[PDB]
Protein backbone atom coordinates (compact mmCIF):
# COMPACT_ATOMS: atom_id res chain seq x y z
CA UNK A 1 0.00 0.00 0.00
CA UNK A 2 1.07 3.67 -0.74
CA UNK A 3 1.41 5.93 2.05
CA UNK A 4 0.88 9.52 0.64
CA UNK A 5 2.26 12.53 2.82
CA UNK A 6 1.19 15.80 2.30
CA UNK A 7 3.31 18.22 3.77
CA UNK A 8 2.79 20.96 5.50
CA UNK A 9 -0.62 20.64 7.61
CA UNK A 10 -1.32 24.04 7.81
CA UNK A 11 0.29 26.68 5.20
CA UNK A 12 -0.66 30.40 5.77
CA UNK A 13 -0.60 32.79 2.98
CA UNK A 14 -2.00 36.30 1.93
CA UNK A 15 -4.01 36.73 -1.04
CA UNK A 16 -2.02 37.21 -4.48
CA UNK A 17 1.09 35.16 -2.76
CA UNK A 18 2.22 31.75 -4.80
CA UNK A 19 1.07 28.41 -2.74
CA UNK A 20 2.94 25.09 -3.45
CA UNK A 21 1.92 22.15 -1.75
CA UNK A 22 3.78 18.95 -1.36
CA UNK A 23 3.05 15.08 -1.52
CA UNK A 24 5.70 12.70 -1.25
CA UNK A 25 4.78 9.25 -1.67
CA UNK A 26 6.30 5.88 0.16
CA UNK A 27 6.74 4.05 -3.11
CA UNK A 28 7.35 5.40 -6.58
CA UNK A 29 3.63 6.02 -7.85
CA UNK A 30 3.26 4.08 -11.11
CA UNK A 31 2.70 6.76 -14.55
CA UNK A 32 2.31 9.30 -12.73
CA UNK A 33 -0.93 8.52 -11.67
CA UNK A 34 -1.46 11.52 -8.71
CA UNK A 35 -4.41 13.85 -8.86
CA UNK A 36 -5.07 16.52 -6.51
CA UNK A 37 -8.36 17.94 -5.47
CA UNK A 38 -9.88 21.22 -3.54
CA UNK A 39 -12.91 21.27 -0.81
CA UNK A 40 -14.24 24.17 0.43
CA UNK A 41 -15.92 24.24 3.76
CA UNK A 42 -19.29 22.36 2.94
CA UNK A 43 -18.77 21.13 -0.56
CA UNK A 44 -17.35 17.49 -2.23
CA UNK A 45 -14.25 17.93 -3.58
CA UNK A 46 -13.28 18.96 -7.22
CA UNK A 47 -10.65 17.86 -9.48
CA UNK A 48 -7.25 19.98 -10.22
CA UNK A 49 -4.92 18.27 -11.33
CA UNK A 50 -4.44 14.31 -12.71
CA UNK A 51 -1.47 12.81 -14.14
CA UNK A 52 0.63 14.91 -12.12
CA UNK A 53 1.03 17.57 -14.74
CA UNK A 54 -2.67 17.59 -16.33
CA UNK A 55 -5.46 20.41 -15.69
CA UNK A 56 -8.72 19.59 -17.08
CA UNK A 57 -10.69 22.59 -19.21
CA UNK A 58 -12.88 25.07 -16.79
CA UNK A 59 -10.04 24.72 -13.96
CA UNK A 60 -8.34 28.23 -13.66
CA UNK A 61 -5.16 28.70 -14.49
CA UNK A 62 -3.59 29.82 -11.62
CA UNK A 63 -3.27 26.10 -11.02
CA UNK A 64 -0.23 24.06 -11.96
CA UNK A 65 0.97 20.02 -10.90
CA UNK A 66 4.92 19.16 -11.40
CA UNK A 67 6.79 16.53 -10.04
CA UNK A 68 7.29 12.22 -10.43
CA UNK A 69 8.16 9.38 -8.63
CA UNK A 70 7.70 9.85 -5.45
CA UNK A 71 7.50 13.70 -4.89
CA UNK A 72 4.77 15.98 -6.29
CA UNK A 73 3.98 19.23 -6.08
CA UNK A 74 0.54 21.58 -6.57
CA UNK A 75 1.23 25.32 -7.48
CA UNK A 76 -1.11 28.05 -7.15
CA UNK A 77 0.57 31.10 -8.72
CA UNK A 78 -1.62 34.13 -7.37
CA UNK A 79 -3.65 33.15 -4.20
CA UNK A 80 -7.70 34.35 -4.97
CA UNK A 81 -9.78 34.11 -1.94
CA UNK A 82 -11.87 31.31 -3.11
CA UNK A 83 -8.51 29.37 -3.25
CA UNK A 84 -7.97 28.97 0.59
CA UNK A 85 -9.16 25.33 0.98
CA UNK A 86 -8.28 22.35 1.66
CA UNK A 87 -6.14 20.25 -0.81
CA UNK A 88 -5.79 16.90 -1.05
CA UNK A 89 -3.60 14.37 -3.65
CA UNK A 90 -3.99 11.00 -4.47
CA UNK A 91 -2.52 8.11 -6.46
CA UNK A 92 -4.08 5.84 -8.59
CA UNK A 93 -1.33 3.82 -9.83
CA UNK A 94 -2.33 1.11 -8.48
CA UNK A 95 -5.72 -0.59 -8.02
CA UNK A 96 -5.39 0.02 -4.10
CA UNK A 97 -5.58 3.78 -4.66
CA UNK A 98 -5.01 6.06 -1.34
CA UNK A 99 -5.30 9.56 -0.80
CA UNK A 100 -3.08 12.14 1.53
CA UNK A 101 -4.60 13.72 5.00
CA UNK A 102 -4.62 16.98 3.39
CA UNK A 103 -3.19 20.38 3.61
CA UNK A 104 -5.06 23.53 4.42
CA UNK A 105 -4.15 26.71 2.83
CA UNK A 106 -5.62 29.80 5.73
CA UNK A 107 -5.22 33.07 5.04
CA UNK A 108 -2.31 35.10 7.01
CA UNK A 109 -2.92 38.18 9.15
CA UNK A 110 -1.98 40.22 12.12
CA UNK A 111 -2.05 38.49 15.65
CA UNK A 112 -5.44 39.26 17.01
CA UNK A 113 -6.03 37.90 21.18
CA UNK A 114 -9.27 36.33 21.68
CA UNK A 115 -12.13 38.86 23.51
CA UNK A 116 -13.25 36.57 26.22
CA UNK A 117 -17.04 36.43 27.49
CA UNK A 118 -18.40 33.65 30.28
CA UNK A 119 -21.75 32.46 30.25
CA UNK A 120 -23.34 30.96 33.58
CA UNK A 121 -26.35 28.11 33.12
CA UNK A 122 -29.99 29.31 32.69
CA UNK A 123 -32.21 28.43 35.31
CA UNK A 124 -34.11 26.82 32.72
CA UNK A 125 -31.14 24.05 32.30
CA UNK A 126 -30.72 23.96 36.15
CA UNK A 127 -34.31 22.41 36.54
CA UNK A 128 -33.52 19.74 34.40
CA UNK A 129 -30.53 19.00 36.65
CA UNK A 130 -27.28 19.56 34.36
CA UNK A 131 -25.42 22.79 34.52
CA UNK A 132 -23.44 23.81 31.15
CA UNK A 133 -21.10 27.01 31.72
CA UNK A 134 -19.98 28.50 28.49
CA UNK A 135 -16.57 30.24 27.39
CA UNK A 136 -16.39 32.13 24.59
CA UNK A 137 -12.96 32.83 22.54
CA UNK A 138 -14.09 35.75 19.77
CA UNK A 139 -12.30 36.94 17.12
CA UNK A 140 -8.43 36.00 17.63
CA UNK A 141 -5.75 34.71 15.10
CA UNK A 142 -3.76 32.25 14.40
CA UNK A 143 -6.14 29.17 15.97
CA UNK A 144 -3.90 27.83 18.74
CA UNK A 145 -5.22 28.63 22.28
CA UNK A 146 -5.68 26.96 25.06
CA UNK A 147 -8.42 27.32 27.76
CA UNK A 148 -8.37 26.16 31.42
CA UNK A 149 -11.60 25.80 33.45
CA UNK A 150 -11.15 26.26 37.14
CA UNK A 151 -13.88 26.24 40.05
CA UNK A 152 -13.21 27.70 43.26
CA UNK A 153 -9.12 27.74 41.95
CA UNK A 154 -9.35 24.35 41.36
CA UNK A 155 -8.31 22.80 38.04
CA UNK A 156 -11.01 20.85 35.97
CA UNK A 157 -9.91 17.95 33.47
CA UNK A 158 -12.29 15.71 31.25
CA UNK A 159 -15.63 17.33 31.83
CA UNK A 160 -15.05 19.30 29.10
CA UNK A 161 -15.49 20.22 25.46
CA UNK A 162 -14.36 22.83 22.93
CA UNK A 163 -15.08 23.64 19.33
CA UNK A 164 -13.30 26.18 16.94
CA UNK A 165 -14.83 27.90 14.07
CA UNK A 166 -13.50 27.62 10.82
CA UNK A 167 -11.75 30.56 9.21
CA UNK A 168 -13.99 33.62 9.02
CA UNK A 169 -14.76 34.87 5.35
CA UNK A 170 -15.00 38.82 6.23
CA UNK A 171 -12.20 39.21 8.56
CA UNK A 172 -9.85 35.77 9.01
CA UNK A 173 -9.76 34.97 12.63
CA UNK A 174 -11.18 32.54 14.36
CA UNK A 175 -13.47 31.84 17.45
CA UNK A 176 -13.64 29.37 19.63
CA UNK A 177 -16.57 27.75 22.60
CA UNK A 178 -15.55 25.86 25.60
CA UNK A 179 -18.24 24.15 27.66
CA UNK A 180 -17.90 22.96 31.42
CA UNK A 181 -20.72 20.52 32.27
CA UNK A 182 -21.77 19.74 35.41
CA UNK A 183 -24.60 18.30 38.00
CA UNK A 184 -26.81 20.66 39.22
CA UNK A 185 -25.03 20.15 42.75
CA UNK A 186 -22.05 20.30 42.49
CA UNK A 187 -22.78 23.38 40.20
CA UNK A 188 -24.17 24.44 43.46
CA UNK A 189 -22.07 23.03 45.66
CA UNK A 190 -19.47 25.68 44.46
CA UNK A 191 -18.97 29.11 44.46
CA UNK A 192 -16.24 30.67 41.67
CA UNK A 193 -16.00 30.03 38.46
CA UNK A 194 -13.03 30.41 36.14
CA UNK A 195 -12.08 29.98 32.43
CA UNK A 196 -8.55 31.15 31.85
CA UNK A 197 -7.11 31.44 28.12
CA UNK A 198 -3.49 31.14 26.63
CA UNK A 199 -2.80 32.76 23.63
CA UNK A 200 -0.08 34.35 21.10
CA UNK A 201 -1.23 37.56 21.14
CA UNK A 202 -1.07 37.67 24.91
CA UNK A 203 2.03 37.53 27.25
CA UNK A 204 -0.46 36.84 30.72
CA UNK A 205 -3.09 34.32 30.62
CA UNK A 206 -6.75 35.73 30.48
CA UNK A 207 -8.70 35.13 32.97
CA UNK A 208 -13.02 35.42 32.77
CA UNK A 209 -14.42 34.39 36.18
CA UNK A 210 -18.07 35.07 37.73
CA UNK A 211 -19.89 34.07 41.45
CA UNK A 212 -23.26 32.29 41.65
CA UNK A 213 -25.22 35.18 41.66
CA UNK A 214 -24.77 37.72 39.03
CA UNK A 215 -25.56 39.03 36.45
CA UNK B 1 -23.26 17.17 -18.33
CA UNK B 2 -22.85 14.18 -16.46
CA UNK B 3 -24.51 14.48 -12.94
CA UNK B 4 -24.29 12.66 -9.55
CA UNK B 5 -26.93 12.33 -7.68
CA UNK B 6 -27.34 10.31 -4.41
CA UNK B 7 -29.48 9.19 -2.05
CA UNK B 8 -30.61 11.13 0.92
CA UNK B 9 -29.21 10.72 5.01
CA UNK B 10 -29.36 7.62 6.83
CA UNK B 11 -29.14 6.43 10.34
CA UNK B 12 -28.16 2.86 11.21
CA UNK B 13 -27.51 0.42 14.58
CA UNK B 14 -24.39 -0.51 14.87
CA UNK B 15 -24.54 -4.02 13.23
CA UNK B 16 -26.73 -3.55 10.30
CA UNK B 17 -26.29 -2.06 6.78
CA UNK B 18 -26.86 0.50 4.61
CA UNK B 19 -27.12 0.60 0.81
CA UNK B 20 -26.48 4.25 -0.83
CA UNK B 21 -26.92 4.97 -4.12
CA UNK B 22 -25.98 7.24 -7.17
CA UNK B 23 -27.60 7.89 -9.96
CA UNK B 24 -25.98 9.24 -12.94
CA UNK B 25 -27.46 11.57 -15.71
CA UNK B 26 -25.38 13.19 -18.34
CA UNK B 27 -22.71 10.99 -20.50
CA UNK B 28 -22.07 7.01 -20.64
CA UNK B 29 -22.76 4.86 -17.66
CA UNK B 30 -21.48 1.30 -18.45
CA UNK B 31 -17.50 2.28 -19.62
CA UNK B 32 -16.68 4.43 -17.14
CA UNK B 33 -15.48 3.95 -13.63
CA UNK B 34 -17.45 4.42 -10.52
CA UNK B 35 -15.55 5.34 -6.97
CA UNK B 36 -17.08 5.70 -3.45
CA UNK B 37 -15.27 7.92 -1.32
CA UNK B 38 -15.87 8.66 2.11
CA UNK B 39 -15.25 11.75 4.67
CA UNK B 40 -15.75 10.58 8.28
CA UNK B 41 -16.47 13.60 10.64
CA UNK B 42 -13.57 16.67 10.54
CA UNK B 43 -11.33 14.18 8.66
CA UNK B 44 -9.84 13.75 4.94
CA UNK B 45 -10.86 11.73 1.99
CA UNK B 46 -11.06 7.96 2.28
CA UNK B 47 -11.15 5.71 -1.15
CA UNK B 48 -13.54 2.75 -0.37
CA UNK B 49 -13.97 0.75 -4.09
CA UNK B 50 -15.14 1.08 -7.05
CA UNK B 51 -16.92 -0.34 -9.80
CA UNK B 52 -17.25 -0.49 -13.75
CA UNK B 53 -20.51 -1.08 -14.79
CA UNK B 54 -19.88 -2.82 -18.29
CA UNK B 55 -19.04 -6.46 -16.28
CA UNK B 56 -19.33 -5.82 -12.77
CA UNK B 57 -15.68 -5.46 -12.60
CA UNK B 58 -15.53 -4.39 -8.79
CA UNK B 59 -12.26 -3.55 -6.78
CA UNK B 60 -12.05 -3.35 -2.96
CA UNK B 61 -10.03 -1.57 -0.45
CA UNK B 62 -8.69 -4.51 1.41
CA UNK B 63 -9.86 -3.06 5.29
CA UNK B 64 -13.60 -2.78 3.53
CA UNK B 65 -13.23 -6.47 2.07
CA UNK B 66 -16.25 -8.78 3.37
CA UNK B 67 -18.32 -5.58 4.38
CA UNK B 68 -18.35 -3.88 0.93
CA UNK B 69 -20.38 -4.84 -2.28
CA UNK B 70 -20.50 -2.02 -4.98
CA UNK B 71 -23.24 -2.77 -8.03
CA UNK B 72 -24.40 -0.60 -10.85
CA UNK B 73 -27.69 -1.31 -12.69
CA UNK B 74 -26.88 0.00 -16.28
CA UNK B 75 -30.90 -0.32 -16.79
CA UNK B 76 -31.32 2.90 -14.53
CA UNK B 77 -27.55 4.24 -14.99
CA UNK B 78 -27.34 3.77 -10.74
CA UNK B 79 -24.58 2.67 -8.90
CA UNK B 80 -24.88 1.31 -5.03
CA UNK B 81 -23.11 1.05 -2.14
CA UNK B 82 -23.53 -1.68 0.53
CA UNK B 83 -21.59 -2.07 3.62
CA UNK B 84 -22.64 -4.34 6.24
CA UNK B 85 -21.48 -4.90 9.89
CA UNK B 86 -21.52 -1.05 10.33
CA UNK B 87 -19.89 0.14 13.34
CA UNK B 88 -19.44 3.94 14.85
CA UNK B 89 -16.42 4.61 13.07
CA UNK B 90 -18.41 4.23 9.67
CA UNK B 91 -20.44 7.57 10.65
CA UNK B 92 -19.13 9.49 7.62
CA UNK B 93 -20.13 11.37 4.68
CA UNK B 94 -20.63 9.05 1.73
CA UNK B 95 -19.45 9.98 -1.69
CA UNK B 96 -19.90 8.88 -5.39
CA UNK B 97 -17.32 9.97 -7.98
CA UNK B 98 -17.27 9.24 -11.58
CA UNK B 99 -13.73 9.57 -13.39
CA UNK B 100 -13.46 11.80 -15.70
CA UNK B 101 -12.46 11.85 -19.68
CA UNK B 102 -10.97 14.50 -22.23
CA UNK B 103 -13.67 16.31 -23.55
CA UNK B 104 -13.75 17.49 -21.19
CA UNK B 105 -17.43 15.70 -21.52
CA UNK B 106 -17.88 14.78 -23.99
CA UNK B 107 -17.84 11.27 -23.55
CA UNK B 108 -14.05 11.06 -24.49
CA UNK B 109 -11.01 8.57 -23.30
CA UNK B 110 -10.72 8.07 -19.27
CA UNK B 111 -8.49 10.03 -17.00
CA UNK B 112 -8.43 7.72 -14.10
CA UNK B 113 -8.94 10.61 -11.42
CA UNK B 114 -12.52 11.59 -9.92
CA UNK B 115 -13.81 14.41 -12.42
CA UNK B 116 -17.86 14.22 -10.97
CA UNK B 117 -18.83 13.90 -7.35
CA UNK B 118 -22.18 13.30 -5.86
CA UNK B 119 -23.70 15.72 -3.48
CA UNK B 120 -22.84 13.31 -0.18
CA UNK B 121 -24.85 11.30 1.65
CA UNK B 122 -24.87 11.70 5.59
CA UNK B 123 -24.39 8.12 7.17
CA UNK B 124 -24.93 8.04 10.92
CA UNK B 125 -24.03 4.87 13.17
CA UNK B 126 -25.15 4.98 16.56
CA UNK B 127 -27.09 3.34 19.69
CA UNK B 128 -28.40 6.63 20.05
CA UNK B 129 -32.25 7.57 19.63
CA UNK B 130 -33.59 10.56 17.04
CA UNK B 131 -34.14 13.42 19.46
CA UNK B 132 -34.35 17.12 19.25
CA UNK B 133 -32.38 19.37 21.18
CA UNK B 134 -33.29 21.48 24.27
CA UNK B 135 -32.21 25.35 23.51
CA UNK B 136 -30.99 27.21 26.32
CA UNK B 137 -30.00 30.56 26.58
CA UNK B 138 -26.73 32.51 26.72
CA UNK B 139 -27.70 35.01 28.68
CA UNK B 140 -25.63 38.43 28.57
CA UNK B 141 -24.14 39.55 31.82
CA UNK B 142 -21.94 42.28 32.81
CA UNK B 143 -19.10 38.78 32.26
CA UNK B 144 -20.11 39.31 28.61
CA UNK B 145 -20.16 42.87 28.48
CA UNK B 146 -17.05 45.28 27.58
CA UNK B 147 -17.26 48.90 26.14
CA UNK B 148 -19.98 49.06 23.61
CA UNK B 149 -19.88 45.53 22.88
CA UNK B 150 -22.23 42.42 24.06
CA UNK B 151 -22.08 38.95 23.68
CA UNK B 152 -25.14 36.76 23.64
CA UNK B 153 -26.09 33.43 22.35
CA UNK B 154 -28.23 29.92 22.60
CA UNK B 155 -26.27 26.74 23.43
CA UNK B 156 -28.27 23.96 21.28
CA UNK B 157 -27.92 20.37 23.66
CA UNK B 158 -28.63 16.63 23.69
CA UNK B 159 -29.69 16.44 19.99
CA UNK B 160 -29.04 13.60 17.46
CA UNK B 161 -28.61 13.05 14.78
CA UNK B 162 -26.31 15.72 12.92
CA UNK B 163 -27.53 18.81 11.22
CA UNK B 164 -29.04 21.76 12.87
CA UNK B 165 -28.86 25.09 11.44
CA UNK B 166 -28.95 28.04 13.70
CA UNK B 167 -30.31 31.60 13.05
CA UNK B 168 -30.80 34.91 14.67
CA UNK B 169 -34.25 37.22 14.45
CA UNK B 170 -35.50 34.68 11.73
CA UNK B 171 -32.20 35.88 9.57
CA UNK B 172 -32.23 39.59 10.77
CA UNK B 173 -29.16 39.30 12.62
CA UNK B 174 -26.52 37.86 10.43
CA UNK B 175 -23.46 39.57 11.08
CA UNK B 176 -21.69 39.11 14.24
CA UNK B 177 -22.61 35.61 14.37
CA UNK B 178 -20.85 32.40 14.96
CA UNK B 179 -22.22 29.02 15.43
CA UNK B 180 -19.46 26.04 16.17
CA UNK B 181 -19.16 22.64 14.61
CA UNK B 182 -21.03 20.46 17.17
CA UNK B 183 -19.57 18.45 19.08
CA UNK B 184 -20.32 14.55 20.39
CA UNK B 185 -20.93 14.38 23.82
CA UNK B 186 -20.21 11.18 25.72
CA UNK B 187 -24.03 10.46 25.82
CA UNK B 188 -23.90 9.76 22.20
CA UNK B 189 -25.77 13.20 21.91
CA UNK B 190 -24.39 16.04 20.18
CA UNK B 191 -24.22 19.88 21.13
CA UNK B 192 -23.21 23.06 19.96
CA UNK B 193 -23.60 27.28 20.55
CA UNK B 194 -24.44 29.95 18.53
CA UNK B 195 -23.28 33.30 19.86
CA UNK B 196 -23.64 36.89 18.23
CA UNK B 197 -22.05 40.54 19.61
CA UNK B 198 -24.13 43.21 19.46
CA UNK B 199 -24.43 46.92 20.98
CA UNK B 200 -24.77 47.26 24.64
CA UNK B 201 -26.90 49.71 24.04
CA UNK B 202 -29.35 47.94 22.55
CA UNK B 203 -29.88 45.38 25.06
CA UNK B 204 -33.06 47.50 26.41
CA UNK B 205 -34.49 48.46 23.18
CA UNK B 206 -33.81 45.00 21.10
CA UNK B 207 -35.13 41.15 21.63
CA UNK B 208 -32.97 38.84 20.56
CA UNK B 209 -34.29 35.50 19.20
CA UNK B 210 -32.24 32.22 17.89
CA UNK B 211 -34.54 29.81 15.66
CA UNK B 212 -32.76 26.42 15.74
CA UNK B 213 -34.26 24.10 13.25
CA UNK B 214 -33.41 20.46 13.22
CA UNK B 215 -34.60 18.51 10.15
CA UNK B 216 -33.73 15.08 11.71
CA UNK B 217 -36.31 15.20 14.41
CA UNK B 218 -38.91 17.81 13.03
CA UNK B 219 -38.23 20.24 15.42
CA UNK B 220 -38.17 24.10 15.27
CA UNK B 221 -37.47 26.17 18.40
CA UNK B 222 -37.43 29.70 19.17
CA UNK B 223 -35.72 30.90 22.23
CA UNK B 224 -35.82 34.74 23.54
CA UNK B 225 -32.55 35.36 25.07
CA UNK B 226 -32.75 38.42 27.75
CA UNK B 227 -29.87 39.88 30.01
CA UNK B 228 -29.15 38.10 33.10
CA UNK C 1 -3.81 -1.47 -12.48
CA UNK C 2 -7.97 -1.41 -12.33
CA UNK C 3 -7.72 1.91 -13.36
CA UNK C 4 -6.67 0.87 -16.37
CA UNK C 5 -9.26 -0.70 -17.83
CA UNK C 6 -11.81 1.76 -18.86
CA UNK C 7 -9.12 3.21 -21.14
CA UNK C 8 -8.31 -0.38 -23.02
CA UNK C 9 -12.91 -0.59 -22.97
CA UNK C 10 -12.62 2.92 -24.74
CA UNK C 11 -9.31 2.10 -27.30
CA UNK C 12 -11.28 -1.18 -28.16
CA UNK C 13 -15.50 0.74 -28.60
CA UNK C 14 -13.26 3.49 -30.76
CA UNK C 15 -11.81 0.39 -33.21
CA UNK C 16 -15.62 -0.74 -32.63
Excluded at chain 1, 11 to 16: A, E, I, T
Excluded at chain 2, 3 to 12: I, Y
Excluded at chain 2, 143 to 160: I, N, P
Amino acid sequence: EIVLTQSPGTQSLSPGERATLSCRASQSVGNNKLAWYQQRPGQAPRLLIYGASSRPSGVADRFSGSGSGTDFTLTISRLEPEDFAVYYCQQYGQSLSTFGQGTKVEVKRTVAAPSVFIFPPSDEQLKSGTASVVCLLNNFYPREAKVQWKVDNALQSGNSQESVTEQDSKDSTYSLSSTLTLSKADYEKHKVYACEVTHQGLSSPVTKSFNRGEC
Amino acid sequence: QVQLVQSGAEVKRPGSSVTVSCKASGGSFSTYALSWVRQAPGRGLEWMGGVIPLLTITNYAPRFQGRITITADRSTSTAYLELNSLRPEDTAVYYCAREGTTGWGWLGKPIGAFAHWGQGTLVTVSSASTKGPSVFPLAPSSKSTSGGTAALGCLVKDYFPEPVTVSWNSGALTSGVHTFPAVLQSSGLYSLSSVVTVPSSSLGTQTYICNVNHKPSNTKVDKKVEPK
Amino acid sequence: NWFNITNXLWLIXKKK
